[PDB]
Amino acid sequence: NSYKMDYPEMGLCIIINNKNFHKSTGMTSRSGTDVDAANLRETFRNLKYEVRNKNDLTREEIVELMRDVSKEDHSKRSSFVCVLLSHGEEGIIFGTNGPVDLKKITNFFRGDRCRSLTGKPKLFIIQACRGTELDCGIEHKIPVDADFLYAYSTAPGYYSWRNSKDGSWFIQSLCAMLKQYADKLEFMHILTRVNRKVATEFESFSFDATFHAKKQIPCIVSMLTKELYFYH
Amino acid sequence: NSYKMDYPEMGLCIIINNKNFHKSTGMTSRSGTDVDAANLRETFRNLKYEVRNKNDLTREEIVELMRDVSKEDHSKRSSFVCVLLSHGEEGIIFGTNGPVDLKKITNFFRGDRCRSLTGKPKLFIIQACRGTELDCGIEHKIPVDADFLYAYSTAPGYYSWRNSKDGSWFIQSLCAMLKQYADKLEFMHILTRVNRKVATEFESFSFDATFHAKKQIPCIVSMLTKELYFYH
Amino acid sequence: DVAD
Amino acid sequence: DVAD
């Protein structure tokens, strides 16, 4: 079985794009992030999502937006997609002025809260580190937290890589697989291909030996109860 | 695209079944866990796994077991499966005499640590609580941590349920689904069916009103790089 | 039903 | 190559 993807609209796709961090935070500029935001905006416009980009939001403005968006009438929408591009740590992503807990952000869309999205897939795509480990490579009543999917760019507790000129390994790979297979494969199958792509094709380059030649594996966290076809 | 599942052997399926705990832990006996241990053993025998059941292991007997198993030559084996049936909290499962970090167990099977499983699917199926949250319901080189799948019985931070008579909602469903579909579906697709089954068909019954009418949603975490089929 |  |  699979989700009803034939409502009037496919749903909205919010893209939070944080490139500039306050001097306070001691957080560098995420160069290449715009490449990603652009790539996503087009991939999701093609699958018929009403896209919206929000640039450099502070920890505060983020909760305001998610709160406002969760109160809109998603009745004639098939799903909801949220992309978070920023710096982060396990369970955390930074606003421009500081770190927001992701649990606080996703809770607005639980089935009990956003009744307009109950029974419909709520996708969260996240590009940001989930810690500081380095991978050196080798060789009817339903649960309120149901119908959620977390496409994480990296394994729990690890570094997530971004190229200053090409964007993040994960986002380039996600947009790539999405346009190559959204017309034929089931979502989980598209993400497994993304997993293999970032796993086999990338490897970091650096003059600083600590950050040179490091690998990465995205992490799919599925609580979906049906198969998701973008085409149906 | 698909993992090579045609090696001489499908692989090992280790089932760690912990039913009775030291009085110091304050952990109640896990009635019904025996039905789970049994159902799993028959299910994976039909899939041609070499099954090994271990009952009531101490936190140190689990580690020494995982370490010896990771030292086995897995050359002629297609995959590895490990099911942990026990009490738990986020990130930890209980040995008979105390808590064990999940990261300590899985680490023996890393790409760089277990060389005869590098590039092969490593499956960890976990039936255990992940916190005390209650769901009330509604309506070249490769990463060392690549090729892991964690089929958790519940969402991060929530309770996981078990029937003293029928066994855990999750293991009941996992086995039913695999009996029905293992010869037709890709693993992630079978697992999505388990999610639908536990989310729609099970609701807790309890004389203690705080534990009555509660829902559960399993949680698939995939770092797999290819599709997995138990048939050839 | 009991919790694990 | 930089990290997030």
The one catalytic residue among A129, A175, A189, A219: A129
List the beta strands (DSSP E) in chain A.
12-17, 50-55, 80-85, 88-89, 92-95, 98-101, 122-127, 148-152, 161-163, 167-168, 219-223
Structure letter (DSSP) for residue A7: S
Are the beta carbons of B81 and B11 closer than 8 angstroms?
yes
Measured CA to CA, the distance from residue A179 to residue B226 in angstroms comes to 19
> Is chain C in touch with chain D: ≥3 Cβ pairs within 8 A?
no
- Which helix or strand (DSSP H or E) is residue D3 part of? strand D2-3
Task: Flag if A87 and D4 touch (Cβ within 8 Å).
Answer: yes
Burial class (CB in 10 A: 0-12, 13-18, 19+), B37: buried
Of the candidates A87, A36, A98, A37, the residue with the CA atom closest to the CA atom of residue A62: A98
- Which helix or strand (DSSP H or E) is residue A105 part of? helix A102-106
Q: What is the 3-state secondary structure (H, E, C) of chain B?
A: CECCCCCCEEEEEEEEECCCCCHHHCCCCCCCHHHHHHHHHHHHHHCCCEEEEEECCCHHHHHHHHHHHHCCCCCCEEEEEEEEECCEECCEEEECCEEEEHHHHHHHHCCCCCHHHCCCCEEEEEECCCCCECECCECCCECCCCCEEEEECCCCCECCEEECCCEEHHHHHHHHHHHHHCCCCCHHHHHHHHHHHHHHHCCCCCCCHHHCCCECCCEEEECCCCECCCCC
List chain A domain ranges. Answer: 1-232
The one catalytic residue among B13, B74, B82, B87: B87
Task: Flag if B31 and C3 touch (Cβ within 8 Å).
Answer: no
Token code pair at residue A186: 């089931």
- What lies within 8 Å, CB to CB, of A136 at 6+ separation is A213, A214, A215, B112, B144
Are the beta carbons of B141 and A139 closer than 8 angstroms?
yes
Experimental method: X-ray
Task: Flag if D1 and A30 touch (Cβ within 8 Å).
Answer: no
Are the beta carbons of B13 and B83 closer than 8 angstroms?
yes
Are the beta carbons of A16 and A54 closer than 8 angstroms?
yes
Measured CA to CA, the distance from residue B143 to residue A216 in angstroms comes to 6
Are the beta carbons of A15 and A85 closer than 8 angstroms?
yes
Sign of the dihedral defined by the CA atoms of residues B187, B189, B194, B195, in that order: positive
Chains that touch C (3 or more CB pairs under 8 A): B
Are the beta carbons of A173 and A198 closer than 8 angstroms?
yes
Fold of the A1-232 domain: Rossmann fold (3.40.50)
Measured CA to CA, the distance from residue A181 to residue A188 in angstroms comes to 11
